[PDB]
Design a binder for this molecule. Structure first.
Ligand SMILES: [Cl-]
Ligand SMILES: [Cl-]
Ligand SMILES: [Cl-]
Ligand SMILES: [Cl-]
Ligand SMILES: [Cl-]
Ligand SMILES: [Cl-]
Ligand SMILES: [Cl-]
Ligand SMILES: [Cl-]
Ligand SMILES: [Cl-]
Ligand SMILES: [Cl-]
Ligand SMILES: [Cl-]
Ligand SMILES: [Cl-]
Lengths: 507, 507, 507, 507
């Protein structure tokens, strides 16, 4: 029961010594125990996520209220997990950073990942969102460009603020994101004291087949706490895993984190009465115009018994929708859908949906076959095994009858490559700057000043142009901050940093 | 229960049409059903086995007699699967060719694979052998050289007899193998009417820790049938899957194939009284000097419900030995042990031993962790999960106490790269030529003559030298056969072959 | 210069013996030469193509005439490779079957692959087509269903006509394809005597940005030859590589195969004057209504120096278009575009476009970085290496200015999952049946009769219904053929086939 | 020249917008530019090294003196790169940590990697060593056990000192390593101010075939600087890439780091006059008994132009030896040799030795073929391409004639699994404790005290037993440190750490 074996089932008698010619002689190839043990060890590492590499997972449950806001949930969506009051749905959630790889400090400035996997009766639903309600760009084509500038340089393997704002200098749509990111909101204190949002615009489909535009929001019961740059540096001094440790230990002691699910519902259409496009993920929907409607509550109450098998292998996709949910023409959203399935086949495996953490908690009958590491076949009991196709007069799985009309929105336009007609990259950025608290603006100006100091002046002028366009005080305060820090830099001594205490050889 | 779903568990309502803008318009990225279905389809194929690609599998059982020959089995080995009379052990067997890839004709000239996986109580045991009792080479270093000459040319993608015997011209040790291969024995009629053997020399270890040299043999109850070149060409005309079809359909109708397991036991040592090395896998052990000892009987009685998941993903390794079995200093055998584990991590997967077909049918407790497509963790119930190492004062699996002395043979010599001192590459080759039946020799001479006709004369002279060294009649008959066929080739017309009936465009 | 080395550059002194303790002793781990050699050998095989696995490649050149038909080529397209008379463009072509894997007989019934890669000055252009002008299905969602029924059964690993027509019974749109496939046209005699076509509908864009619907055709100068089933069985008896051998040997002796490129141009639009949809790939365009227009001629004159490095690693994609070419709303075509890139990253590699055979023969400047086996970085001379994104004020590659208007067709409709309004699955099928020659119809009826004999009657009735709808005589002849063949089967006895000559053990 | 293109060579006109139906409509599959760009991006990440993931690389040169110490280098070795005075050999060096993954703080306690690749005329030579002269274990079978305890826990994803010393409690041979590791020597200030060593025992072979035991040492010209835990915490606060930054910035400004290569030569044999085994890698060779002999000097003077393509893809193996160098019976060394090639085929690729950074800078002629991402074939000019095997009468690469006798040491003994007869796990550990400086001992006791505080007492007692066996004062000081720190912990209150400043929702 507790006897050490090989994966072939061979009981191991000596886990200490290799088989050699003499006690101090050479190893022979008569060492299967050694081979198998090391063969598997050499291939433990799978490639990390191209983004959101550093993360932590937790199991939990979602409770529905049966209604959206103060009116029945059936009015806007027919998603089965929402229909009944008190209906519990098992979930797995992974929190994460964005920029740097695994085992990187969780005190770094970054958006935070907030992915929730709903194991519903209509299959799985992945809500792949972040902490901030918006994103840097509005077109998915710019994503590898954004990440490359955000990630460590291919020449130094270190993040560069110059490289970061170099891309921002040509991307005015990221202004609103920067205003949030370089504020204290760019470094959440922990995952428990953090907001969540689907960022992109989605759609809800009801019994009638009617669709409405939808925003998702996670509101923490624990409240919201942010980490200033001074505070972040202090934590990082002795702890580069503080956020992972915070979530795990809280669940371990019974202090279960909770989030309330809110939704913003909007009538389908262009809405020309707005100065912004509702399909722009660099835009928020004002609560005074589009109030938040309560849907349910999620509680995380169980830690993974194995980080790799569950959290690391967990795979989330925006296309993973259940009946009642649908896409919108958010160009960012539809772009995402492609990459998730694409990257997960490579990272987690060809049959990654057959893994316990990714597999749905219900019946599955597909004609999909084979693939590497195929653990099971999606046949049903009594099926003619030789039938792996549809249609078939002999056997095999059948289509599901429609119990509700499909959502068929009207789409008209020319096949073009053009930006949206209402960019407005400075509008909401200025609003958020003014609506900030004093200590939040101070942190924003301080961070931007320290970041843009020493950077190419062509970049500086363009960023100052963007900040000024959002708010005059915004632009002026950053400009003065830059001039001040560039002046102080000029009056020091930039010799190479000396580390450690001088020592002498022991031999 | 029979409703078609995605692997996310989403019930599919339309498996016929993609989601498009209009019934005849362009596809959108709002097609997760399409994406997932095709995403998995594009990665169905895993790399085929580098050798023995074409094959067929079958489940079965092995019954032990409790004795070896007419004396107790405990005298020579302490392998648990042999100790009790009537003791049944589940097995999975894969038959195969060698040279060409999957879906290649099973009527081709090749050695035949005969791999048996024993799911014993001491873990799994893989007996990876062939139909012929010997092999081409005596050193594993020559294996990629042998296979490259055997396999289709890198310039034509077609097998070449000139390339084949080009390598044989510099490899006199393959003479005995050629004598068998180009005889009718090179094309077994089917897998059911075929012999089996471990080819390499192994070792049996008893209760005392004493070791003896061992040869394995599978004797078919159905008898032995071979396929002549004329007969093989006739079958190939309408059936390139005849051997796979033969085994499957026989089990399907209840005609279960059976093999008796025989063993040849030899005292450990150099044995200088022999003209051949007992560790040379190009050598057989004469029955008159080393009689065959019955051990048990194997019956194959169940076909795989899925060829890919079971047969294709099946992984066999010569190092996979249970207690009571051990290696010998067969340089070919020890070389094999490395490649099997090496190639299976790449082909089947990093966690290929976690697959149902490869996993042992007992308890497994290892400190091995992670790897791609990790379906489970080798922990035991109640274990401290954070302990994945040995030794440990906290928890984790423990070593197994020795219930019998380990086999510790004496090894003396200089670390050298040298061939065995008793090569004798022509001895047994000549014996087998003379011991052949008339119709077997006729086929041998006919095949060699047709193969060596047109080949470079430097190769021909060297091969004729080898054949003559084995037997004077052997060499002379092949020489005359070559001269005859080269003369007949000279008197024809070698225009490019014309195929099919002339046709005309339909448009 | 000719000295055998390791891939580390180490001169090999002994390629015959492994390093062991004594000439007949055990191998040590002191064998890097052995390790590296077998380590690479164990991973020679990459996964075969999920479809069109068996194939052969050839290098060549394409000559443009500068005009389409009798009018300038610039009138309809601005593709640079067509503009000048006598303009030569390097090409690589791979011919292939469809159903079975590598090293499978080329005498089997299948559509034949005809993929051409154009190394133009505007980058690469892949024309991924077949010999037949149409395909089985009109929606890419059905592709894995089609292939699964076409491919060997997951229970027997053998193709089954019952499984094939089981899918066809629920797919009436495949009727026209079947009419061609089970005719002599289903087995081309060789690749040189074979037609080629893009099958799908494409678009040509000129200087004005105007688009026109387009069909591609390859007409062999050598003529067209088809292989009857009786002729195919005779060839298969002694040669399962006859088509591969035919192309290679012809090029080797100087007999270079040639194809003339024809195009069918059609005004963009719905075209309600047709009984078929021009975007349906199960439909041909009648020459009497849409004449074939000559474009150029292609000549294949060089064989690959390495089959694997060139032919096996070759990657073709329908999305790989140069300026002047574009997509259509062919639901089949757009579906293909997804799968090629998806499967090639897995099969050939993440950086497969960096391989010599797939890499363009011009300038390449991308912001794409890394990936496994990254051989080079897409930077230009003098570039700031730390800039791998766009836009950038510092450095990096810049966008290309538009020298011609982009094609922006009007698209209106509801986001639906619905079939085309003009299916007409039997129309052209019947016409082709009547337009057949007598020997072509006889072969068609003979093949269908032998295939549908013994098959479940539910399948038979549906197929007979489809054949009859195309043509009354068509249905009746097949019906009579089935009744006749099912009757002769009833007067047989289905015992297990006996193979080979009885033999006796040699030991 | 600077125009942005696809990897197909297609000039990109719009790198900002995806192709959609209308400026704000859905994406179509008519987006190859989008597809290819994201398809490659989704697969940028390769699996990180299972150990030494975090690292930095640098190009350089090595100058030989032509002699070892004060006597000719030819006396002990015939390695070509050492024979001539002033002989320069191109090198690539990668420095690294051990425990945590990529982008992990370089201020962490760990051994430091020091891998050097020599591009010699006899091929490549990899000297894969660390900064410390010894290692934790003496048998490679314990390596995955060691790393698992050292690496973050599978339940918390955080390193645990309890898990670390849990393994050490059952591994007394790691005592000497711990004495160094928890001293200031466990955190080198930077890579430039750091020693290097091959750790394992190697062999040098001369013109006579005579072999001698060998230790390698890298002595930094810049001197040696270590980083205390207090100093490390201060650096980690604002910089987790300080060591990577230090090496890069130094080379960039012209301050090239230099190391002198020293060797320790010892007569081959058991050497019964020692209280330790010279093949034990947990043992150093006393300079007073075995003086350091100068060999040459290495200078690093060029930074990688691409971190991934060069540093990340760099592959080092202990088996990669040139003529004149050889193995010893160091059970640790021979174990390593297996794992490097095994893990690098998986990590870097099947053809990783074909990559520019790993490929030798000389002639390469192998019979190795294929493998994924095969960029070239190892054929020579004029070779018959169809010959990919040895021997061959037709063509192909030939063996190299021996210009010097091979080293063939005598090996006698029984095939056993047993530890060395002279373990002595506390001897040198105690000596190093006394030879330490006061500030070095203080740091050692301080680190051990803080680490073992709160840990299971069974572990504590075993470690205290090990420390005491090395030195009585050693054990007592740690014991007092533990008692003191466990007492101050008892006078605390272990509430959950509170992070960040309280904030409020912005919406
Ligand atoms: Cl709070
Ligand atoms: Cl899957
Ligand atoms: Cl399916
Ligand atoms: Cl039925
Ligand atoms: Cl018989
Ligand atoms: Cl495994
Ligand atoms: Cl283990
Ligand atoms: Cl315990
Ligand atoms: Cl690529
Ligand atoms: Cl790009
Ligand atoms: Cl390689
Ligand atoms: Cl080789």
């Amino acid at each position: 029961g507790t006897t050490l074996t090989t994966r072939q089932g061979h009981p191991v008698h000596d886990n200490q010594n290799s088989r050699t010619v003499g006690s101090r002689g050479p190893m022979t190839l008569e060492n299967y125990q050694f081979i198998e043990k090391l063969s598997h060890f050499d291939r433990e590492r799978i490639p990390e996520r191209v983004v959101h590499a550093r993360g932590v997972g937790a199991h939990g449950v979602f409770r529905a209220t049966g209604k959206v806001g103060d009116e029945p949930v059936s009015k806007y969506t027919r998603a089965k997990l929402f229909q009944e009051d008190g209906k519990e749905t098992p979930v797995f959630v992974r929190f994460s950073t964005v920029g740097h790889g695994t085992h990187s400090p969780e005190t770094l400035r970054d958006p935070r990942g907030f992915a929730v996997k709903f194991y519903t009766e209509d299959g799985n639903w992945d809500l792949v969102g972040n902490n901030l309600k918006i994103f840097f760009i509005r077109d998915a084509l710019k994503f590898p460009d954004l990440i490359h500038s955000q990630k460590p340089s291919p020449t130094t393997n270190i993040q560069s603020q110059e490289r970061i704002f170099d891309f921002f200098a040509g991307s005015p749509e990221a202004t609103h994101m920067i205003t949030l990111l370089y504020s204290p909101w760019g470094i959440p204190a922990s995952y428990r004291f953090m907001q969540g949002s689907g960022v992109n615009t989605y759609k809800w489909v009801n019994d009638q087949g009617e669709g409405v535009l939808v925003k998702y929001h996670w509101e923490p019961v624990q409240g919201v706490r942010n980490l200033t740059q001074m505070q972040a540096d202090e934590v990082q001094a002795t702890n580069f895993n503080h956020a992972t440790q915070d979530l795990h230990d809280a669940i371990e002691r019974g202090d279960f984190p909770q989030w309330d699910l809110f939704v913003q519902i909007m009538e389908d259409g262009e809405h020309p009465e707005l100065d912004f496009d509702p399909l722009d993920d660099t835009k928020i929907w004002p609560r005074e115009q589009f109030p938040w409607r309560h849907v349910g509550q999620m509680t995380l109450n169980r830690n993974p018994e194995n980080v790799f098998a569950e959290t690391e292998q967990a795979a989330f996709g925006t296309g993973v929708l259940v009946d009642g949910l649908d896409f919108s023409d958010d160009k960012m959203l539809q772009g995402r859908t492609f990459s998730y399935s694409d990257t997960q086949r490579y990272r987690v495996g060809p049959n990654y949906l057959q893994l316990p953490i990714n597999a749905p908690k219900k019946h599955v009958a597909t004609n999909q076959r084979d693939g590497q590491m195929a653990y099971r076949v999606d046949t049903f009991e009594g099926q003619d095994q030789r039938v792996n196709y549809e249609p078939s007069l002999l056997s095999g799985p059948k289509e599901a009858p429609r119990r509700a009309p499909e959502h068929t929105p009207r789409v008209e336009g020319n096949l073009v490559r053009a930006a949206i007609e209402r960019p407005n990259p400075f509008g909401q950025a200025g609003m958020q700057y003014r609506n900030f608290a004093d200590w939040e603006r101070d942190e924003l100006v301080s961070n931007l000043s320290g970041a843009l100091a020493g950077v190419d002046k062509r970049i500086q002028d363009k960023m100052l142009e963007y900040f000024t366009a959002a708010d005059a005080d915004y632009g002026q305060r950053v400009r003065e901050g830059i001039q001040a820090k560039e002046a102080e830099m000029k009056g020091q001594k930039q010799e190479a940093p000396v580390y450690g205490t001088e020592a002498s050889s022991l031999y």
